[PDB]
């Protein structure tokens, strides 16, 4: 995508936010029609700039475009939480078809924080007959977008068979992620507790199991 | 007041071919015309190409020219202002480059300088190009939880595990229940499993009125688990 | 004058390629019952259309692919006699019969009967059953009108029976040579087919042979009522309404009055 | 382009606003000659182009109580209401036909006729009476 | 920003029933039958029948609820005793 | 104030020209419906609804020839004459009816629509056309 956009955008609860798009002479903003797409990552999108500045259908007023001779801006007024997502921006003619942009994350703060909810749990009675062991630590109900788990047998680190998701946004406007930590039934057997530990950047989750319990 | 609906999820190999249907109902379906866009995480969203199922027109782009056929029926009318057509679409020489999520639109208008422009989006179609197999998952009832000792709240889930292919729905006790459901989403393991959980908090005066009953349903392995969460609770916080 | 133009039309529906005129095409007003005469025909497929197929008592109205030829002849050499009744007045009667006597008759070609109700018989299936069987035996009884193909030809009016026509079963292959199928007619001069009960048409005689060949494009059958879903369904001819003749000329038609007062918001200001 | 009577019937109201005076020009005169006398069949075809004259002249009469008078495209002084057809520009004139326009102002039709015979000719007449003096 | 503008000679037309014309076909005064079925008072055919198709327009008919079917109806019968009418009575043949 | 159709036959006719539009509006289609076909019955009614329009379009002919065209108050260029009604303003438009109107005008107004169909538009487009080259 030659297409080029802004990096990586935050901002602030209800203030204001501008994106940009641009590129060479030859995919130039200076005789072509310009449109925006809000973009959650694995849902519906939504067209909300089209063609030039003229919104969408629906779309409130708080969204706004402009095109210059060498760029296309973005511009939304009194950022909600649900505006936290990924744009995206198309070049195209009458007859052309879509051209996308490079993408750029936008990130509304100022909000509520979240404590997290962090709950760790042991195979059961099928997978021991399985002959496998998987320990489970669900993450969910997190603000930032970052977290870093740790798995300790017998609260010494472990390396190996050690999975951890990517951040996730909950349809409630927070995020969830979660881990996943494979052993064997030697190993199960010769250890007392289990931990996994989520860092968060202002605190720290822990949950401790037993095989004996 | 379009309600589209595309395909189902399938699981494929690489340089095979798989076809995606995309059903319309609620409008004109030769009136506007027919956008296709994936979403790969090797190289972001890509515009496929559109379809004009009046005048028999398509524009793809030129990476596409080749692997890319795409198909349309006749519009069924229903009324005089409603008709439900369909879209097809067929890929082939698939690679590793073409996993992710794919989406079929509706055009913008019906004249001007933007008319192609993808504005009722479907609800998706995700498609994973592996050579692997087919696994079915082992699905886990989860032990109630304490989420406020005061109010008197537990949390009880169902456990999905170790499965390759596309990721699966769940409904509570056959869909009659939706508050409080809460579903994961799926991990990654060093051999390509894809594990998930999902959890709901209920009261936990909500033991002797109510059953809850967790349904699973993984459509390309073609296989459902109807699981019953023991409400016989193990927290020291929820037992007092 | 809105026009439907596809091919296949169920007459009660949305039609998809719609054309307007003025003036319709050409419909010869033809009087006949069982059998539609000189109709139009239909496009590509044997149509069958109803009110309501489930319900028994509404006719079948049937529209033909392949015209189906037929020939009536009154084969009577007759003469008319003008006798004088009041001073204007002149009352035209049948004269004596000039060379021999025989029952006027239509004939229908036995090869193209059979084609056509094989024809017939897949269009109905799709309604009834695949692979199922249907019979079609003659009328029931009642009115001389409704029991016989009654219509007109130079000035006579042929009651024809057309009970040589409908004694048939059908595998779902075949059914259960002979050039032609001739039909015995009588014929009937004075009608009380008004509506006005309150008068009846005398037919004057017709000096001569008549003989008068036609296109036949339909068919009004009723079905047999009853619990009769596992077991087979029967198709008798029908009519008496005159409006179901009409029905197969007039179905691809509807009135339409303009409305061409339209309002709608754009930017501008006067004075 | 033309494409005849009622060519645009589907077509974006804006398109079809490039056929007007076709659609005008076919409905007023649909001559038929009555020349030949027969009694009772022509009271039924003469009460129908009767009638239709009636019909006309009620449209011109609706267009004639407006300040809209001219047999052409025009324009008033009544502001839209958002209540109607909650939609913004070239959504309508190039994603609509005329007969889905009328069905969703049908709700709302009704009272717009009366908001263009009285807020305007009953008050617009009055302003231009005690305007013209100077 | 936006007032609302009347636009006469818009392509709307809401289903109803009227009156209906009939055909002479043309070929009636070849003819000298003196009188066919409507040669008494239907006006002649136009040159060329405006047979216009219209584009995107999906209509919803019904053959079994038309008023088409009703006129003429009711015009073969008032064509059948107009026809009967001056003609000659037979009642003395009722002997 | 409205009051309906005829409304201020009796008010002042100041207070009556506020009804213009009413009285327009219910005088062109008292529209019957006459699709049953009984024989010598219509003939009557329809003849009725016939000379409706004929005397409808007598008086457009004569909205037409004058300067005056739009179904409104509309003003001309021929001068009141003091002989006709010897009154002031406001002696007119606010203690007399157009029914008492007509009444002293039936006097001297067969010569008021002469000299507005001669006086004006025989001249007055005849200055047009030798006043619009330049
Ligand atoms: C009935 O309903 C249907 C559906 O609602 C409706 O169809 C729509 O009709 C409208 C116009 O009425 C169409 O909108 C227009 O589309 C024009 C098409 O693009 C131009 O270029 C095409 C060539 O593509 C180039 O690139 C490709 C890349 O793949 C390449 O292969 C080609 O070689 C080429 O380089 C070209 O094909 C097209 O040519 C005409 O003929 C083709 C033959 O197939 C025909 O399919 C086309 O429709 C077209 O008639 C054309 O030249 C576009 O140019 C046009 O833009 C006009 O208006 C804008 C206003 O801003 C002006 O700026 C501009 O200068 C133009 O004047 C406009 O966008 C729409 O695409 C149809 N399709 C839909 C919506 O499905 C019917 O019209 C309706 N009919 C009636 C009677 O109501
Ligand atoms: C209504 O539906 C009915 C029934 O579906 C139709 O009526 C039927 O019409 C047919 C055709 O006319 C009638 O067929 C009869 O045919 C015989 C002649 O065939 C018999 O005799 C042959 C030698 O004379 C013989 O070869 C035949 O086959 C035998 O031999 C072969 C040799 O290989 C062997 O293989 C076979 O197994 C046989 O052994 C066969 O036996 C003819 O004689 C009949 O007419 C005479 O007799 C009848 C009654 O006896 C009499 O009524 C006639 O006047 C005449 O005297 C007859 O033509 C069949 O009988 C009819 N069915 C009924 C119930 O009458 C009917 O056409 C449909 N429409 C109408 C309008 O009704
Ligand atoms: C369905 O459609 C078919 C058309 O195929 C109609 O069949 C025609 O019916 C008409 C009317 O009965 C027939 O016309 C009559 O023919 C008689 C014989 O004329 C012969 O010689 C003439 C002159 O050369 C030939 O043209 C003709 O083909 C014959 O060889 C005439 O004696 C009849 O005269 C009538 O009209 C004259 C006109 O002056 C009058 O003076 C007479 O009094 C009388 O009214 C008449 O012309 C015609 O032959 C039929 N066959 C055709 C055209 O194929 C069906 O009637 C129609 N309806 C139904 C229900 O089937
Ligand atoms: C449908 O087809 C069936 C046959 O499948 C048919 O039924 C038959 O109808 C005929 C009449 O068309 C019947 O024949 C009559 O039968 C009675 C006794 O039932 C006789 O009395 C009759 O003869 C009288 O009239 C003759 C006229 O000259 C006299 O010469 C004689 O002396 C008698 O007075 C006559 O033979 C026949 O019985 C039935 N039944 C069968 C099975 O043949 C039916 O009519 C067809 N149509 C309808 C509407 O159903
Ligand atoms: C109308 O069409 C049907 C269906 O085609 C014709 O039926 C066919 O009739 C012939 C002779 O009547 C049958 O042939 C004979 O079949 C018997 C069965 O036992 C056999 O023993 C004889 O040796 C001879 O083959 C034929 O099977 C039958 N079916 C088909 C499919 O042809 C019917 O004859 C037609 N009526 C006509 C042409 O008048
Ligand atoms: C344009 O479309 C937007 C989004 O659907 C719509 O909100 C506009 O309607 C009105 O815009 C006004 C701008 O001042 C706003 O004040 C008003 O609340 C709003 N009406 C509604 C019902 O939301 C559309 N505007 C036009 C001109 O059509
Ligand atoms: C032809 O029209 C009939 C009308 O009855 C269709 O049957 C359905 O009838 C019910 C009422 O009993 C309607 O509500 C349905 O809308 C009709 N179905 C459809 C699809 O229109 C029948 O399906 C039509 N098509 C054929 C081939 O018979
Ligand atoms: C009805 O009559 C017509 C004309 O008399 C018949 O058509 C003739 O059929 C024979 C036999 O096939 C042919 O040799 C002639 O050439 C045909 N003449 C014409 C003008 O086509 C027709 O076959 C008759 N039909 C029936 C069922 O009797
Ligand atoms: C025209 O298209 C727009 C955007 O695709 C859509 O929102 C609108 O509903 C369409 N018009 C109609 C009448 O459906
Ligand atoms: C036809 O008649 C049956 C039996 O009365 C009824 O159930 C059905 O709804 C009818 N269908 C229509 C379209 O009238
Ligand atoms: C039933 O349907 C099948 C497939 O649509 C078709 O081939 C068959 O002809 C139908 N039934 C019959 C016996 O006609
Ligand atoms: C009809 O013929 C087909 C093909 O030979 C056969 O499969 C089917 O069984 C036959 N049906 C009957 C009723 O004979
Ligand atoms: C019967 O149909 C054929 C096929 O077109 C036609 O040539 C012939 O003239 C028709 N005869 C009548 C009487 O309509
Ligand atoms: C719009 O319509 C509503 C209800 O008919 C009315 O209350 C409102 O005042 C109207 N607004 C305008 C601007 O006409
Ligand atoms: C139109 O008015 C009717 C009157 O009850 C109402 O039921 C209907 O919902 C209205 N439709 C719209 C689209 O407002
Ligand atoms: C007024 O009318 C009288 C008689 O009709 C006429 O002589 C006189 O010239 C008129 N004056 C004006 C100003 O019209
Ligand atoms: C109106 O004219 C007649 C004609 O003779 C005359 O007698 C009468 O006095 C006149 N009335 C007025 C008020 O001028």
Redesign the pocket.
Known sequence: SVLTQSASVSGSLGQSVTISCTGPNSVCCSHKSISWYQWPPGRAPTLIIYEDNERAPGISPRFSGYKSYWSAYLTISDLRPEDETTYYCCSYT???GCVFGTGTKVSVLGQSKANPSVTLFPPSSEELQANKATLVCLISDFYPGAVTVAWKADSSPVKAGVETTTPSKQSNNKYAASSYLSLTPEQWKSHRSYSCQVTHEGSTVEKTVAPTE | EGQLVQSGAELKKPGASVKISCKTSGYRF????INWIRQTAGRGPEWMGWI?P??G?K?LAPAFQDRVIMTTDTEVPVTSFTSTGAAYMEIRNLKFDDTGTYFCAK?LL????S??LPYLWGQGTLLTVSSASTKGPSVFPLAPSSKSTSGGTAALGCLVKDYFPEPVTVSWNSGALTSGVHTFPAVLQSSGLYSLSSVVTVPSSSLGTQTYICNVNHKPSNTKVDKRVEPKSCDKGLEV | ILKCKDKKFNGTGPCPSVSTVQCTHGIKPVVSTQLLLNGSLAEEEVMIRSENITNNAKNILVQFNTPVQINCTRPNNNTRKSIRIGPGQAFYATGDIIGDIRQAHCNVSKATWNETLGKVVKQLRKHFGNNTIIRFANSSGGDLEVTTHSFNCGGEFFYCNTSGLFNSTWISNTSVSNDSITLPCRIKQIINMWQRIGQAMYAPPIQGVIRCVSNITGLILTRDGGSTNSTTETFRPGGGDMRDNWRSELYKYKVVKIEPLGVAPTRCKRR | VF?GFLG?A??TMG?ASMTLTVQARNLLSGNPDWLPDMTVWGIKQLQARVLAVERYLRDQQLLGIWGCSGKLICCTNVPWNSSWSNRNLSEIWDNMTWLQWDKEISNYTQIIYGLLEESQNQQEKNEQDLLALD | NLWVTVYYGVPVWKDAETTLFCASDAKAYDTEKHNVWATHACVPTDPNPQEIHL??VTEEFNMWKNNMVEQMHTDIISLWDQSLKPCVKLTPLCV
């Open positions: 009458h007859n052309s | 030769n009136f506007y015309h004009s009046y005048s027109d524009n055009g019906r004249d001007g300088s008319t192609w | 494409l645009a589907g077509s398109a | 584009e995107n």
